[PDB]
Each structure stands twice: as structure tokens, then as C-alpha cells.
Amino acid sequence: SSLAEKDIQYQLHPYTNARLHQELGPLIIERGQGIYVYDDQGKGYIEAMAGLWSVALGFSNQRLIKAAEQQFNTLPFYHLFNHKSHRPSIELAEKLIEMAPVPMSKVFFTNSGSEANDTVVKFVWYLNNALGKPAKKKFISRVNGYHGVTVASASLTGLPGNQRGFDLPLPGFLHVGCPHHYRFALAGESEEHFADRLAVELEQKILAEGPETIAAFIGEPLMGAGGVIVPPRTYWEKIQKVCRKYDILVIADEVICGFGRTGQMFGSQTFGIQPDIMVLSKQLSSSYQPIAAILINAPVFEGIADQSQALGALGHGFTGSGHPVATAVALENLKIIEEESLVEHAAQMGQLLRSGLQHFIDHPLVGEIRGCGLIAAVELVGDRVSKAPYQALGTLGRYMAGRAQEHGMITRAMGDAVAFCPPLIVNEQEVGMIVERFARALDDTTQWVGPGG
């Protein structure tokens, strides 16, 4: 049996058509270095997605690899249960609290972003029980938001592909509108008037459900997996006013935006969010180890702490919570981002990426070019006036991502939008090569469609 035949025989793949997988088999990735990965045929690709929006320092950072070795040879596993602790969890918790964009009290560690958001749901229910508000339990999130895949975190998620066939969302998980002006604003509506209408939708949902029943609002500052959706001017200001009016917690899901993706250290800084709770993962460790972190402010911590005393202990934790190798690698990762000024470098490389894509702004298949910092998308359309797709919605995105792969670049299609999220270490020539491979894929796609006009 070949390695490809064994893959087909033995693995159920995430985010894959299992029947199509039995016919086509895998694309096997063998090795990586810098911004590049190589398949088992020796073909090289720029990883323009940094894997899954995550590999901040690229695929061969020797400082992360040596940090792992040193921790393995000291203490390769221990836990944080029943007052037990270890140095790497303590030093990473200190660094995260001291770099937070608003005053924060404590860190709780998990393996995944999905586990982290699931834990935030439990901690908010625990808190409101502790404060004697047993009705204050409902969550509000947005259409096309992504918050993970557990029964609870996939209920917060607003992408139908995460819910159809899974009996989700659960009761008490509500959704308001996707803040994408290009797709959901009225003809001739300003960004500010769109933001007004979204803030009115939220207030009317709160009043309809009963304000006393609404615990929390969760959002990505900029929505990643749902299409690199930049919210309209004044959205976060007006949404937070409505939340503060009804005593609703604001949760910033920073799993993609965290650690320099949007032009500042946090999406909360870029978009003027003052959250009660932050969720972090992905670039936290450059995905070299599975780890996520929850930051909670003083009021959230004090209520949980009171209830943990009354009930004997906090009845929650994962075996891997604060894993000493994962925390050691994340701590070294954050030191490198600070020491090499990668937040400022990423902001400069992002201006070059956006300028390169903007040469195609009057192309007949280019509907919108969006992003900020070092995250971007180009949304393709069959018709710029109607914004209608070529053939079925998703046809241009799938064709573009296939052509990009042929031209030695891995990008991700989100319907008809193709994404860019390269490693923070990308250099000026490499940004040039990313835009060149985009341009070759667009030329291929244009010849296939034949726009005329």
C-alpha cells in the first residue's frame, strides 16, 4: 500500500467530502521551511494562509523547536488541578495579562479555540448563577461568525455548514446580522447608517427576548473564516453602547486577530473594543503546539471565585490545560514577536499586499478587495452591478484556489472570496510572489469565464 492508499483506507478527514476523498485521495505535505511547504512529489508552495491562519513564525523557527526540547527534558507533562502548577504556565499567564489591551485579572488555558469558547459559555452560566441571576443565560452572536465546532461553540458559530445535519444551534444561542456592507447594506446606504441599523436590530432582539435573559455578546473583531469581513465604521462603538445599556458581557474572539494580524497587537486595539473576556489561540504558539487561552476581567473572576468556594472547587478542566511543552513554546513565540518587532513589520507587509491586489480593482470579475494589517480577501463576482455569481455561488472561489495551487500557492476559498493570511515573517519579495501567483490564477479564471462586455 502507498501512503495515499493508507490515508484513504484509515482516516476520516475534517472539512472534506468523504466519498470524493475515496476517489481523489489526499494532497500529502512532507516538509516546510520559512513560508514554504513541499508535497511528497517535491513541489513547493507558498503557504499564503500560514496553515490555518496560524503559523506566525513560519515552518522552521529553531527557537520554538529548542524551547520544546528544553521543556521535554525538564518536565514533559504536568497539570494545574487541585493547586498544582509549573513555571511555563505561570510565566505565560503573566505575559498575557501584562500585554492585554484592557485591564484583565486571570488566564484559564485549554487545548483549542473550540474548547475555549465552550468554556466561556460554562463560565458565564456559572457567574450569573453565582450573582443570583439564573435567567441571564442567552448568548447573541452573528450570521457567518466562526467560534469553533463543539455542540455549544458550533451553536455560537453562524455558518450554516457548521450546523446543517447536526441539530444546531441549541436553544438560547441567538444570531443577529452579518456586518458586511458590500452584501447586506441597502442600495445607497452609508457604513454609519448600516451600523445604526445593526445596533437597532441588536437592541430589538434584546427587548423581544427580555433583557434580563441576555448574558453575553460574542464577536471576532474582524470575521476570519466567514470571509475576512471588516465591520463598518462606528459598528463596534454603537454595539458596545447597546451591550453596556442592558448589562451584557462583550467577548472578543481574537483566535485569528491575536498577536499582530490586524496592524496592532490585538483586533480589540484596531477596532476600539473594551472586552470583558478575550479568547486567544492559533498565532499564540504559531500552531507548533495545541494551546488556547481565555483572559477574564475582575468582575468575571470575582463571581466565579466566590461560587468555587461555596461549591468546594471549580468543577472544570482539561488534562492538557496549561500543558508545560505547549505553554513553553507559546511563551518563546510571544518573546520573538516582541523582540523582532513583527507587529510593525506585518503592518508594512500588509500595505504592500493590499497595494498589489488593488491593481485589479477595475477587473470585470473583481467585486471587492478588503482587509487590514496582514489579512485580506478578494471577492470575485460574475457581474459587478448585480454582485451575482458566475454559475453557482462558490464556482469562482473553487476555480481560483485550484489555479493558485497549480501556480505554487495555498489559499482558501470562502464562497467566492479567496483569503490571504501569510506568516508575519513574510518579506517584501515574498509579498510580490504572493500577488504574482494570485494574478496568474486570475488570468486562468478570466480565460475560463470569457467576460466579454
Next chain:
Amino acid sequence: SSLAEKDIQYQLHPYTNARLHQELGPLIIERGQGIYVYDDQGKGYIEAMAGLWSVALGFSNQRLIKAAEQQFNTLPFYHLFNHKSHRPSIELAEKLIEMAPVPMSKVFFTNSGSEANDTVVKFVWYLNNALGKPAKKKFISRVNGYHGVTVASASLTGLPGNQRGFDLPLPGFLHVGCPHHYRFALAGESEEHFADRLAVELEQKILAEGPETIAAFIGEPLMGAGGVIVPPRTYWEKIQKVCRKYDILVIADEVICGFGRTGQMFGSQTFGIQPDIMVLSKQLSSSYQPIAAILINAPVFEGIADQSQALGALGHGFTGSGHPVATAVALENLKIIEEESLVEHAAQMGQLLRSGLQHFIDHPLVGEIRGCGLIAAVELVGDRVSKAPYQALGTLGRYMAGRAQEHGMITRAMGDAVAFCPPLIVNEQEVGMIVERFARALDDTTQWVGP
């Protein structure tokens, strides 16, 4: 400014009283080797729990550490989404399918046991929707079962500490009896008659709820975190007959029993279980990396595969699913357990542990000694005739576990029981030292409770 002060300032601890933590601070563990860990004052402890029921090869296995280094220097991260793959995920999936105790079709990888059980809930809902049985969605688990801490997996869990204050369980997550003869059998009742009554309870729950509404039954072959509870003779045979009668999936939660804990490779082998689905973690990697695995049989795969075609793709996955460093370490871990014959070594060390503890069967505070393979527990009581606690349930267990720590041994209290789950590499004199530190803690506890 001290490391302990920083811990108090910045960390919320799992399974901890946060206010008591602000007063006492942490016990900081600095380093480990073999079966030992050491605190920041240089004091050494036997890790009689193998960390969290998990560190099978001990705290200094150089083969696992080199396997990690080699994978880091090749490909330190990639994913399995959208047909992408990599060698360590493929070779581990092959090894897990070929070593399975019943015929299995496919592996799906997660980071944690909690994520794995949560994923099994979603996959069973997805399957029954695919088969046109939209009502067949309810799960049955047991009192004192432990299946993890997500909103869904803590609903499967049967321990009140995991549910009180969290508004759990969710609707459609049902619980039948804990199969613990010492606590729940009627006066006189044999193990076989206890098993009969538990099988009748399950059948009556299924009929009361509507058989067409019941998707799955989940159980640990023996219950770990809920008290090291060995089920009575004939339990698993009779429960499986009832499940097969109403077309109910049997899920074996092997997160603790997996890879030689119970005297055979799997708890399913020890207890004669033929599951449709298995869940694995912990000893899978000796916890050197966060990883868990779901094994599904042919019928479960064929239904999920058809639905993934109809809906365009399987709308489920974790960033870390099949992480190449975690899969590389787990693959090397399973090779070592096989090459060093640690299933048979663990079985021999387990007989020594259980025979050593049995010397204390007639101690006035010992209610029950239980175990199988290299997992055991001693339950203390304030009165052997009534089986009543001293003061309140948990008072003896808290004091016992604290005295064991003073005597250089880390054990875990489960109410008034203390647990034993040492690394599989434990040697004969090390088992002797574990029993001796238990004995010193028991002497201390006896003098404390006093006349």
C-alpha cells in the same frame, strides 16, 4: 515577585477552590524522571497517578522526546482539512485500526477526550439524520461516569461536581445506575442478580423514553475518575444484549482503560465489550502531547460518508486535529508499549499492588479495596457496618491524600477513596514503596480520627 505570587496573581486553576488558592498558593512542580516528580524546594514524590491517569512511560522517555524533535525539524504544523494530509497522521491511523480489538473502519483525531466525546455526540446526530431517523438522538450514560467537561461531554458525565452551577445536563442526556456492588446492591444480592437488575433498569428506561428516540449507550469499561468502579460479573454481556435488542450504538470510553491499564491492551478485551465506537486519549501519548482518537466501525462511517457527500463536506474539525508532532509522539509511544511488552509487565506489577493493599482489608477505617490490572482504590469509612462517612463524604479522602503527599506520594481523592494508577514502567520495589506511603498516610488518618 516570587513564582508562587505570580501564580496567585494571574492563573485561574481547574478543579481548585479559587479563594483557598489566593491564601495558600500553588505546589510548583519543577522537573520529573521515571515515576518521580520534584517540587521547587527539591522534594521528590512518586507520581502514583501517572499525572492524570496518563503518563504510561514515565517522565523521562528519550524516544518520545527525539520523535518530537525529528517531526519539528521536518514539518512542525500542518492540517487534515480539504483533503490535505501528512505521514504521522496516516501511520498512527493505520496502527490504531490494525490493533483494534474489534473490526474498525476509520480514525478521527481531536486534541482532548472531552472534544472526542463531544464529536461522537455530533457524529451520532449526523448519522441518524442521514438514515432518516430524526427522533433517534438521546444518549444514555451512568451515575459517576466521567466523559469530560464540554457543555455536551459534561452532560454525558454522571458526577454532580461537573454539573452543579453549570445548568447541566442538557435535555436528551439520560443516566442509569452506577454498577458499584458495595454501594448499590440490595442486602444479600449476588453480583449476577445485581447485573440482572441493572440490565432491567436500562430496558425500562428505553421503553419509558421510546426505543425509537435512543441513539447510543456510552460507558467506561471500568469507571476511573468516578471511583475505580469494577462492574459486577455478567454486567457488560447483559447490557449489550439490551442495546442490540433496540438498535442502540455501544460506545466504549477507553480514555483511561486504553493501552494496558486493565491487564489487556483494551478494557473492551478485559470485560468482553464489542463496541461500535471507541474513544482513546491519555496513555495514547503518555500525555507528552495533547491528542485523542475516535475509532468508528463500517456502518457508522458509511452513513457519515454519504451525508458528507449530500451536504458538500463534513462541517467539523479542530485546527489541531491530527497535529503532526502529537501524532508522531503517539505513534512512537504505542511502538514502545508493544516492543517492551508493557501490557504483561503492568499486569504483573498490578498483582503485586493489589496483594500489598489486601494486607489492610481488616483495618477499622477500610470499607473496600477494589481494582483490576494496574488500577486500584481503597475506600475509607467512619463505620464498616453502616458504610457511613466520618463527618461528611470526602473528609477522610481529603486528609488521606494530603498525608500521602507529605510522605512523598501523589494520589487523588474520589470522595473517601484514594486512587492508584502508576506509570506502566513501575518496578517491584517501587510498588512496595507505593503501598508503604499508603500505610503511613493510613496510620496518620487513624490517629487523626482518634478514639
